[PDB]
Write a protein that binds this ligand. Structure first.
Ligand SMILES: COc1ccccc1O
Length: 162
């Protein structure tokens, strides 16, 4: 297991524009296209992202290309974030994947409500962190996925990903 296999399990792979768990136009391996309810806006974003007229459909290679970019940008975003970087740097590699997964799903603005969890993670108070992590809109809206990511934060193992 590594971050790609992990997020591939959590995000799935769909080659045509679909709506994510939040109802937002998405394609590929959790590549968010837009929050706009306008499908034409999403199709425009898609063509922009891929560099050709896709008419709402891409290939597996193109999905994986966006996925590579998206994972990379999540990591680079964490590293530029004054609040996230020291926590992330304190973590071992497996728990770092949990952090990337969370940011990938919810963005940095999302992981901002997680001040208390972040402190507990930095302190390596793993069971406390895991309890705090689950007290969230995140967990309640996507509980099976959040349980996997939280187990990853709690144990630093890939147990939840089989
Ligand atoms: C709350 O989990 C994180 C820890 C460190 C960096 C990013 C995170 O989402």
């Amino acid at each position: 297991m590594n971050i790609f296999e992990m997020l591939r399990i959590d995000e799935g792979l769909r080659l045509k524009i679909y709506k994510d768990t939040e109802g937002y136009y998405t394609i590929g391996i959790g590549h968010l296209l837009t929050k706009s309810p306008d499908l034409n806006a999403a199709k425009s974003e898609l063509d922009k992202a891929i560099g050709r007229n896709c008419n709402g459909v891409i290939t597996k290679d193109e999905a994986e290309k966006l996925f590579n970019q998206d994972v990379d940008a999540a990591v680079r975003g964490i590293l530029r974030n004054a609040k996230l970087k020291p926590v992330y740097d304190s973590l071992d590699a497996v728990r770092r994947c949990a952090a990337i997964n969370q940011v990938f799903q919810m963005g940095e603005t999302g992981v901002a409500g997680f001040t208390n969890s972040l402190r507990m993670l930095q302190q390596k108070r793993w069971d406390e962190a895991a309890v705090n992590l689950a007290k969230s809109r995140w967990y309640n809206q996507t509980p099976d996925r959040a349980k996997r990511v939280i187990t990853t934060f709690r144990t630093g193992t890939w147990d939840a990903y089989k």
